[PDB]
Design a protein around this ligand. Structure first.
Ligand code: HEA
Ligand code: HEA
Ligand SMILES: CCCCC/C=C/C/C=C\C/C=C\C/C=C\CCCC(=O)O[C@H](COC(=O)CCCCCCCCCCCCCCCCC)COP(=O)(O)OCCN
Ligand SMILES: CCCCCC/C=C/CCCCCCCCCC(=O)O[C@H](COC(=O)CCCCCCCCCCCCCCC)COP(=O)(O)OC[C@@H](O)CO
Ligand SMILES: CCCCCCCCCCO[C@@H]1O[C@H](CO)[C@@H](O[C@H]2O[C@H](CO)[C@@H](O)[C@H](O)[C@H]2O)[C@H](O)[C@H]1O
Ligand code: CUA
Ligand SMILES: [Cu+2]
Ligand SMILES: [Mg+2]
Ligand code: NA
Ligand SMILES: [Zn+2]
Lengths: 84, 259, 227, 46, 514, 105, 144, 98, 58, 43, 73, 79, 49
């Protein structure tokens, strides 16, 4: 339960810098590439006015009361469907 | 003259201003939710920030500049930080209990399934996996910073701490983008509720932890920390590891198992 | 129903409530004996000028006062759990009745055969017929066949309520989105009263339950006449 | 520094027992009266 | 100087005094609310003519007594005065954060008063269950002000728990182990651990209630896939630890009082007392669903919660019998504080036993949401807390103030209160067994006799509370200054005189390790 | 923990120490009256003679009072102990509390 | 004699029957005749008079056991005053009934109760023990 | 890699923290961080109790593992005895600081 | 930059009787007055808001 | 406990005044509200 | 002039405790027999006697003739 | 076979106090059966057991709302 | 010297008891409180239908 690395004898700053630049930041760079390759907008699904979604029991305290705080017109329909 | 090692604190106005800031924030949220006005809330947020700034400023004055943090005082502050983190763990435990309650027993209104009918979860292998690598990496770089500081290496402490902060900011910006791009919202039933309230309080804690690391960065630029005495840095690192571990549990529970 | 100056439980209408009565008698005897023993030992400790103020060794007497309470707890828990699982045992009902809580009245649905449903409201005090009970009568009683196992299903169409009939030993919360099941069997005909038992707002005090237990043939004809 | 000793380690004066009686009367009496005036207030609204 | 001392305090004794004053004022509010409850019920029919107001009075009664009277007096008041003195510490670990725990409470109380003044109040019960507490059945600001009142009280107590745990672990003399600290200090440490773990779960649940009411979440709303029963689990996961939080400092004070007025150097069975409080604290986290036996719970879960609940009687009995064993052989001083403590032992025992009745879920089906539960907890909680508070207050008033009470008046006060609380609550057992629901503004006529008697009892305790205020006035009016206190060799908090100087233990105690 | 006679003998030895000091006299008596017993006459005798070596008449009388107090409602014990002590009381000129009027309220 | 507040850290005098020999003498300062009395105490106590012996006792101690253990009449004051204040409470309840409470519901009228009682017996309320069990349906009267 | 620039406690500790550090270096405990070790506690070998004033509270744990601590003021002058176990303590006033 | 901690240690240890929250100099007093004024003024305003919200309006 | 005699003794008459004032401070405002309940409910 | 006999002088509190705890136990056992006879068994016999010859249809007919039911005249 | 329906029998799939899922499952089963029998021909009469069971157990308002949502195209279960 | 209790205890006990019984009996019986005791042995049942 310790990966396949293995370099001790008096832990220190030099080893944790080695891990930072040799394992941790390369992994971030790999996941960044993976993410940037699967990016791009996907086709939004048909709108269906499901009653368990788009809940409105009280108007929101901003805007017109009917838009969520990080409303994205492209992918977040209102209770009455997508905005034009 | 005392002959114990503990700190008798000068009489202070910040407890009262912090309490009044809490009154103004809460009455302010009430005014915003029910009386269409942000005024009280803005005043309360401002006085809260002023209180935090002057209070922790004074703690730096009492310790770096006046010498009151003997080993006994520092040990108390270690216990205090550990106990504070434990209370924050239990706060998150309440939101995880809500998530598992709703997802392990999906009601008919959802379609009787999880994720609910009509919910299209984010792909956990895209930006959520990137966010995981980013916070895990920041736990490695903050450990490098801690060892550099203990070994008396100013430049590499600053480099490693800057990288840690940069990753915290990267996470925050990625999560903000994910919030904007998500096709479901907080109003999308219990899926949106659990998703945004649990990840949203976690995001708040990333912002708090990042701010705390930034405070440590500037104190380090100003030579406050010695190679053996730097509890503010240790507390910020403990808090940062807490934020990282809460993220791993959100990733596994909500993003992966809950997809 | 309760009667004036009543000290204990209503008389049992159902076998399960009779079991509860005997279990309560058993447990109350224990409660009385322990509360009296503590009061008596207090008085014993406080009624002598003799003293002994040096350190007293504890571990011997702490065996007695953990083991004997554990034994007492076991003697409560054994019949307690027997009744719990007897309650839960399979009964095979011959009728299902639903009740829905509302602010502030109950509705009932008998939909095994025909679509029968109705609302049940408290009789206002100013409209009580002579000899009727203030706050307990309803306009439309829950008529049920006596001597028969009935499945009650309990829910709500607004806030929480709770459907209770003390003399049958029944209390089942009424929760929107949830269908809670309990079983009911009256050994006798008659009128059996209960009251909403989860605070549900301004008129929580004023939405009672009245069961009317009669022979099957009367229940059948009543049901048909209520369609 | 601060005053120490009986009567001095409290945020209210006990130098005059009748002024104290008034102050204690106002203090405990205002807390006891408040719920009665909250009820009156809610009754008068509707 | 006045502002620096009393608004900018960093002193554990002055902060303790602030809490005792706040808690006594809250007690007046909570008592007035209780008299309105009993006035509505003292004859059949309607008094207020407005049951939403009745429900608001009941709700506010409980929040005031729990969060503004008992916890501030026990933990803020006796805890801050006594804990640093009993371990020879020069103050709390975080003396300035301690002052914020105090000053969050007046705003918290202001929010609760605000909730009752706006709209029609929060007529919810102190449980605040949805959907009654949601934005359709309680539209408007009242329930949100209640939620925010609880948030501030919760922050006050979480920070206070951090303070107490840190102080007790870290600031004892170096030779003093945890098994050489007095029982009241143990009782505060354990209460603080319970607060630290339980209050964040309440904060999560009431925050989810706040967002269902204002942000269109649906944690508790079946229309979105939510569940009202989830709120009940989160509330009572806090709420059962909370009832032990309300009594544990009381147990600690009772141990000291019974030891002192028995003329003993020590309580009987110290390590058993420590074990018992730790065991009660631990078991107090695994029993909460006995507040939910009628919600539609599976039989095997009912059997588990029945059984785990009953086991708490074992450590609790060790404490009761150990208090009796402390009296045994004592040179008994029949002081007023001793009378409070002996009233506590008996009344707590009665209440705890009716709790064991309720633990049996089969009987709880018939007793839940009736006056039997109200009778249970006004014995074990309301009388338990109030009698331990009055015992501690009478016993330590000369330490805090430097002046003595009139002991004859204090015994008269005890006698009146003992009659009053028992007349008030004992008949409520009959009302519950015979099926009267709680949270009702009126009752079927059969229940009239015991409701009448109960409400007459409530006025007797009112007379006792008025007399208590007079007795405190008379002590400060007459100024009998303390001279000699017995048994200081085993009661360290008295050894610096009465009142102790502003700074104590500037030179720490000397304790050898042998 | 030991036999009655061994307990008594340790206490007799305690008070018979020739150069017992005032502090030890008081420690001894204040410790002894914590036990569940009225001290045997032979213990009281040794304590009274310690009072004599310490030129403390008043504490000798007080010790007689605490024997009567430790007997509680057993009114037969104190006159028995005084009876057994009379030769020592006479030898040392110790008056009983009763002879001094110190039993009056 | 005079105990002062500033003496709180010094060994003190107490009269307690479980602490018979306190840490200090009741009287510390001696007059000329009291000094001579303490010198005489070094000789045979048989040569002390009763009054001298009492005086030596009262220099050492404040109260005797009989004095410090005396019973008092305080219980009469306590019980009597408690009953006065409980009596005063009934005045408050009288005031409340007169000025606060209006009439109770019409279901408490005698005729209503008599009819309601008959209907309770007709529906056999609590027929095993509680209520109708006490009615004799054969004799049409309450059982004796 | 490596490098300096981080102050040490020796360089930059101040105030009471620095007093405690310098005293510890000399094996001294003016701020009472350590538990004192008992002597045999006889009248010839009393426990020596430092103080900056002429009285200090002693807590005596008379026997190992007693839970009850016996507290009393120890005054300058002749050794005093614990009222429970009799072991002796003698105040050694003053010094420590200026 | 440069390690100026010793200069701040001298400033905050000066024997001038000032409490720590004012010991940095005149800007501490300004910031304190701003904070306390906003707090007390905000609290008075919250009380006005309570008075307004305590009664029905159209 | 022992204590000094009162520095400012409160005589029986003075106690009767303090007691009566204390009781009136609790009873008069609440009594006024409860006496006028009808006046409030009919508004 | 008769000497007094030596009375018991040791363990008087413990001896009192033992005697009355035994007495407490005996009383508790006595109350338990009274309570089982006066309450628990009384209730068992009352329900058993009630139901031994109980005729539910006869009880219904009595109630019906008294006019108590909505569903039966 | 085995008719004379009185009420819905005990169902070991749903043995506990909460019977929501029993109502829900039988409502789904009836409507899935009905859809199947309508498309490929046949008679809904073979779906009758599910019909009687969900009618016995389900609150009228639940059935009504679910029916309305099937007609609207917003029913979230699979049929 | 006799204290307050020696001088006045007898009168406080006697007067307080006499006052308490008199005012509770008056409250209980003379001002119209309806205690609603059991009808058993007290009420003659009357036809209602
Ligand atoms: C001081 C606060 C306090 C304390 C300490 C307790 C202690 C206990 N309580 Fe109580 N309780 C409340 C305050 C408290 N409670 C409150 C406020 C509520 C309701 C809140 C609401 O709904 O608003 C409540 C509700 C409540 C319920 C839910 C009832 C319902 O709503 O239907 C239950 C159920 O099991 C319960 C049980 C117990 C038990 C078993 C104990 C045990 O810890 C008691 C153990 C003590 C003893 C048993 C006595 C001493 C023991 C001996 C002498 C030994 C020998 C005894 C035996 C062998 C039995 N409590
Ligand atoms: C600590 C908790 C506490 C206390 C002390 C009390 C005290 C009292 N309560 Fe209680 N009560 C609750 C907690 C408490 N209550 C709770 C949790 C509920 C449930 C609410 C709900 O249903 O949601 C409740 C509900 C409740 C009801 C049921 C309402 C209903 O179901 O409709 C009743 C009815 O009689 C009642 C009456 C009283 C009375 C008459 C008193 C007292 O008048 C009795 C006498 C006691 C006092 C007068 C205390 C005075 C103390 C001080 C003045 C402090 C002094 C300070 C110092 C010395 C420093 N209460
Ligand atoms: C991304 C970075 C943004 C800048 C930094 C912001 C920090 C905010 C931190 C505090 C958050 C605290 C409360 C959290 C409540 C919910 C917010 C959840 C996270 C979030 O931001 O949720 C989003 C906004 O939601 C929303 O309502 C936003 C609602 C805004 C009001 C939030 C605060 C409401 C009151 C909270 C009271 C909390 C009390 C806590 C007490 C704790 C114990 C003392 C979701 O956007 P959406 O448009 O629905 O969906 C995306 C669709 N494309
Ligand atoms: C973007 C703006 C966001 C605004 C809102 C959130 C604001 C919070 C900002 C984040 C927190 C900043 C905390 C700064 C603390 C600075 C003071 C400090 O770090 O003080 C240290 C002590 O630690 C101490 O008190 C440690 C004290 C505890 C600090 C805990 C901080 C985390 C908790 C914050 C609140 C979270 C609330 C969450 C609610 C959901 C000083 O001791 P040392 O470091 O050893 O130095 C001495 C040596 O120099 C001697 O040689
Ligand atoms: C539950 C807590 C309280 C319980 C018990 C309260 C006991 C009451 C004490 C007296 O209260 C006063 O009673 C007066 C009547 O006796 C009222 O005067 C009222 O009635 C008088 C005539 O009866 C008029 O002269 C006044 O103007 C009119 O205000 C008066 O306002 C009220 O202060
Ligand atoms: Cu419906 Cu309470
Ligand atoms: Cu509980
Ligand atoms: Mg309930
Ligand atoms: Na009423
Ligand atoms: Zn010792």
């Amino acid at each position: 339960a310790s990966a396949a690395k293995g370099d001790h004898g008096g832990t220190g700053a030099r080893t944790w810098r080695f891990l930072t630049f040799g394992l941790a930041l390369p992994s971030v760079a790999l996941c960044t590439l993976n993410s940037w390759l699967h990016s791009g907008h996907r086709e939004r699904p048909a709108f269906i006015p499901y009653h368990h979604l788009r809940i409105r029991t009280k108007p929101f305290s901003w805007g017109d009361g009917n838009h969520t705080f990080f409303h994205n017109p492209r992918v977040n329909p209102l209770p009455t469907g997508y905005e034009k | 003259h005392q002959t114990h090692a503990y700190h008798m604190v000068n009489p202070s106005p910040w407890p009262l201003t912090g309490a009044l800031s809490a009154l103004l924030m809460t009455s302010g949220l009430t005014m915003w939710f029910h009386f269409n006005s942000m005024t009280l809330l803005m005043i309360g947020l401002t006085t809260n920030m002023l209180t935090m700034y002057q209070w922790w400023r004074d703690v730096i004055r009492e310790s770096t500049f006046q010498g009151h943090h003997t080993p006994a005082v520092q040990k108390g502050l270690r216990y205090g930080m550990i106990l504070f983190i434990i209370s924050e763990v239990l706060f998150f435990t309440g939101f995880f209990w809500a998530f598992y309650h709703s997802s392990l027993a999906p009601t008919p209104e959802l379609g009787g399934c999880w994720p609910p009918t009509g919910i299209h979860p984010l792909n956990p292998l895209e930006v959520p996996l990137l966010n995981t690598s980013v916070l895990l990496a920041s736990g490695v770089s903050i450990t490098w910073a801690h060892h550099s500081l203990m070994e008396g290496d100013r430049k590499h402490m600053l480099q490693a701490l800057f990288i840690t902060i940069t990753l915290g900011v990267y996470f925050t910006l990625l999560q903000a983008s994910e919030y904007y791009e998500a096709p479901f919202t907080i109003s999308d039933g219990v899926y949106g509720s659990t998703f945004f309230v649990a990840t949203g309080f976690h995001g708040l804690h990333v912002i708090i932890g990042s701010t705390f690391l930034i405070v440590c960065f500037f104190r380090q630029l100003k030579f406050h920390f010695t190679s053996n005495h730097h509890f503010g840095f240790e507390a910020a690192a403990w808090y940062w590891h807490f934020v990282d571990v809460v993220w791993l549990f959100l990733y596994v529970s909500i993003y992966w198992w809950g997809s | 129903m309760a009667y004036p100056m009543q000290l204990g439980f209503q008389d049992a209408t159902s076998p399960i409530m009779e079991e509860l009565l005997h279990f309560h008698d058993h447990t109350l005897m224990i409660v009385f004996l322990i509360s009296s023993l503590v009061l008596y030992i207090i008085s014993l400790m406080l009624t002598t000028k003799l003293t002994h103020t040096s350190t007293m060794d504890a571990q011997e007497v702490e065996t007695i006062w953990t083991i004997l309470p554990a034994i007492i707890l076991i003697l409560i828990a054994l019949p307690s759990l027997r009744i719990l699982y007897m309650m839960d045992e399979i009964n095979n009902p011959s009728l299902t009745v639903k009740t829905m809580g509302h602010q502030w009245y109950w509705s009932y649905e008998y939909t095994d055969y025909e679509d029968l449903s109705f609302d049940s409201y408290m009789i206002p005090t100013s409209e009580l017929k002579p000899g009727e009970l203030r706050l307990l009568e309803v306009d439309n009683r829950v008529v049920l066949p006596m001597e028969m196992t009935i499945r009650m299903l309990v829910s709500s169409e607004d806030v929480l309520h709770s459907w209770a009939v003390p003399s049958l030993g029944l209390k089942t919360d009424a929760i929107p989105g949830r269908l809670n099941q309990t079983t009911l069997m009256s050994s006798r005909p008659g009128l059996y009263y209960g009251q909403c038992s989860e605070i549900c707002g301004s008129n929580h005090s004023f939405m009672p339950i009245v069961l009317e237990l009669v022979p099957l043939k009367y229940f059948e004809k009543w049901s048909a006449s209520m369609l | 520094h601060y005053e120490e000793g009986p009567g001095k380690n409290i945020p209210f004066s006990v130098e005059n027992k009748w002024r104290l009686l008034a102050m204690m009367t106002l203090f405990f009496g205002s807390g006891f009266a408040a719920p009665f005036f909250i009820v009156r207030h809610q009754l008068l609204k509707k | 100087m006045f502002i620096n001392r009393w608004l900018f305090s960093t002193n554990h004794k002055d902060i303790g005094t602030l809490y005792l004053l706040f808690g006594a004022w809250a007690g007046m509010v909570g008592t007035a609310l209780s008299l309105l409850i009993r006035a509505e019920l003292g004859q059949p029919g309607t008094l207020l003519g407005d049951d939403q107001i009745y429900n608001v009075v009941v709700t506010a009664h409980a929040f005031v007594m729990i969060f503004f009277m008992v916890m501030p007096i026990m933990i803020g008041g006796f805890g801050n005065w006594l804990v640093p003195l009993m371990i020879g510490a020069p103050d709390m670990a975080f003396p300035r954060m301690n002052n914020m725990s105090f000053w969050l409470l007046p705003p918290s109380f202001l929010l609760l008063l605000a909730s009752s003044m706006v709209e029609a109040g929060a007529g919810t019960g102190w449980t605040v269950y949805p959907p009654l507490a949601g934005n359709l059945a309680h539209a408007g600001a009242s329930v949100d002000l209640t939620i925010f009142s609880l948030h501030l009280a919760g922050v006050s107590s979480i920070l206070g728990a951090i303070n107490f745990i840190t102080t007790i672990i870290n600031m004892k003399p170096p030779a003093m182990s945890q098994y050489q600290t007095p029982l009241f200090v143990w009782s505060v440490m354990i209460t603080a651990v319970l607060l630290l773990l339980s209050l964040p779960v309440l904060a999560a649940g009431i925050t989810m209630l706040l967002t269902d009411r204002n942000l269109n979440t649906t944690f508790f709303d079946p229309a979105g896939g939510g569940d009202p029963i989830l709120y009940q689990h989160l509330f009572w996961f806090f709420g059962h630890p909370e009832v032990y939080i309300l009594i544990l400092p009381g147990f600690g004070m009772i141990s000291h009082i019974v030891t002192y007025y028995s003329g003993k150097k020590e309580p009987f069975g110290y390590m058993g007392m420590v074990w018992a409080m730790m065991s009660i604290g631990f078991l107090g986290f695994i029993v909460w669903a006995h507040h939910m036996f009628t919600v539609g719970m599976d039989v095997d879960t009912r059997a588990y919660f029945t059984s785990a609940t009953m086991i708490i009687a074992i450590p609790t009995g060790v404490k009761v019998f150990s208090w009796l064993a402390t009296l045994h052989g004592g040179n008994i001083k029949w002081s007023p504080a001793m009378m409070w403590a002996l009233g506590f032992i008996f009344l707590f025992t009665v209440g705890g036993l009716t709790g064991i009745v309720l633990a049996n879920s089969s009987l709880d089906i018939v007793l839940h949401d009736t006056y039997y539960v109200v009778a249970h907890f006004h014995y074990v909680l309301s009388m338990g807390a109030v009698f331990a508070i009055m015992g501690g207050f009478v016993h330590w008033f000369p330490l805090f103030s430097g002046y003595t009470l009139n002991d004859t008046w204090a015994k008269i006060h005890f006698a009146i209160m003992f009659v009053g609380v028992n007349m008030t609550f004992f008949p409520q057992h009959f009302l519950g067994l015979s099926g009267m629901p709680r949270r009702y503004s009126d009752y079927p006529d059969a229940y009239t006799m015991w409701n009448t008697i109960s409400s007459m009892g409530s006025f007797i305790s009112l007379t006792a509370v008025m007399l208590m205020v007079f007795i405190i006035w008379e002590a400060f009016a007459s100024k009998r200054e303390v001279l000699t206190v017995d048994l200081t060799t085993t009661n360290l908090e008295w050894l610096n005189g009465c009142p102790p100087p502003y700074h104590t233990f500037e030179e720490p105690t000397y304790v050898n390790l042998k | 923990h030991e036999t009655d006679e061994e307990f008594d003998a340790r206490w007799v030895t305690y008070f018979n120490k020739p150069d017992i000091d005032a502090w030890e006299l008081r420690k001894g008596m204040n410790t002894l009256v914590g036990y569940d017993l009225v001290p045997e006459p032979k213990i009281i005798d040794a304590a009274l003679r310690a009072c004599r070596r310490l030129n403390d008449f008043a504490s000798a009388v007080r010790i007689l009072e605490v024997v009567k107090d430790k007997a509680g409602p057993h009114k037969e014990i104190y006159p028995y102990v005084i009876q057994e002590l009379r030769p020592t009381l006479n030898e040392l000129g110790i008056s009983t509390p009763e002879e001094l009027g110190l039993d009056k309220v | 004699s005079v105990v002062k507040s500033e003496d709180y850290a010094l060994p003190s005098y107490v009269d307690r029957r479980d602490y018979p020999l306190p840490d200090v003498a009741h009287v510390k300062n001696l007059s000329a005749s009291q000094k001579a009395l303490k010198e005489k105490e070094k000789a045979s106590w048989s040569s002390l008079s009763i009054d001298e012996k009492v005086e030596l006792y009262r220099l050492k101690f404040k109260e005797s056991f009989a004095e410090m253990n005396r019973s008092t009449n305080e219980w009469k004051t306590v019980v009597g005053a408690a009953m006065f204040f409980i009596g005063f409470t009934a005045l408050l309840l009288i005031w409340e009934k007169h000025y606060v409470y209006g009439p109770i519901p019409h279901t408490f009228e005698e005729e209503w109760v008599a009819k309601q009682t008959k209907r309770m017996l007709d529906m056999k309320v609590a027929p095993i023990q509680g209520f109708s069990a006490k009615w004799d349906y054969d004799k049409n009267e309450w059982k004796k | 890699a490596s490098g300096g620039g981080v102050p040490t406690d020796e360089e930059q500790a101040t105030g009471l923290e620095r007093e405690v550090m310098l005293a510890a270096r000399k094996g001294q405990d003016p701020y009472n961080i350590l538990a004192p070790k008992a002597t045999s506690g006889t009248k010839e070998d009393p426990n020596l109790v430092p103080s900056i004033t002429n009285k200090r509270i002693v807590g005596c744990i008379c026997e190992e593992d007693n839970s009850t601590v016996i507290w009393f003021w120890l005054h300058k002058g002749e050794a005093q005895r614990c009222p429970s176990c009799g072991t002796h303590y003698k105040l050694v006033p003053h010094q420590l600081a200026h | 930059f440069e390690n100026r901690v010793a200069e701040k240690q001298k400033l905050f240890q000066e024997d001038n009787g000032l409490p720590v929250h004012l010991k940095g100099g005149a800007t501490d007093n300004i910031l304190y007055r701003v904070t306390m004024t906003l707090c007390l003024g905000g609290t008075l305003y919250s009380l006005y808001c309570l008075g307004w919200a305590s009664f029905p309006h159209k | 406990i022992t204590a000094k005699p009162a520095k400012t003794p409160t005589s029986p008459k003075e106690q009767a005044i303090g007691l009566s004032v204390t009781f009136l401070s609790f009873l008069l405002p609440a009594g006024w509200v409860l006496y006028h309940l009808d006046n409030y409910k009919k508004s | 002039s008769t000497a007094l006999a030596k009375p018991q002088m040791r363990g008087l509190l413990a001896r009192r405790l033992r005697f009355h705890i035994v007495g407490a136990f005996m009383v508790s056992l006595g109350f338990a027999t009274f309570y089982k006879f006066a309450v628990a068994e009384k209730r068992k016999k009352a329900y058993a006697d009630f139901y031994r010859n109980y005729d539910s249809m006869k009880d219904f007919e009595e109630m019906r003739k008294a006019g108590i039911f909505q569903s039966a005249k | 076979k085995i008719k004379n329906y009185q009420t819905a029998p005990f169902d070991s799939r749903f043995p506990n106090q909460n019977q929501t899922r029993n109502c829900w499952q039988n409502y789904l089963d009836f409507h899935r059966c009905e859809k199947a029998m309508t498309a490929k021909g046949g008679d809904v009469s073979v779906c009758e057991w599910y019909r009687r069971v969900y009618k016995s157990l389900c609150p009228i308002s639940w059935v009504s709302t679910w029916d309305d949502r099937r007609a609207e195209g917003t029913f979230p279960g699979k049929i | 010297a006799p204290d307050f209790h020696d001088k006045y205890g007898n009168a406080v006990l006697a007067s307080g008891a006499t006052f308490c019984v008199a005012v509770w009996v008056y409250m209980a019986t003379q001002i119209g409180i309806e205690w609603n005791p059991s009808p058993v042995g007290r009420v003659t049942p009357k036809e209602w239908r």
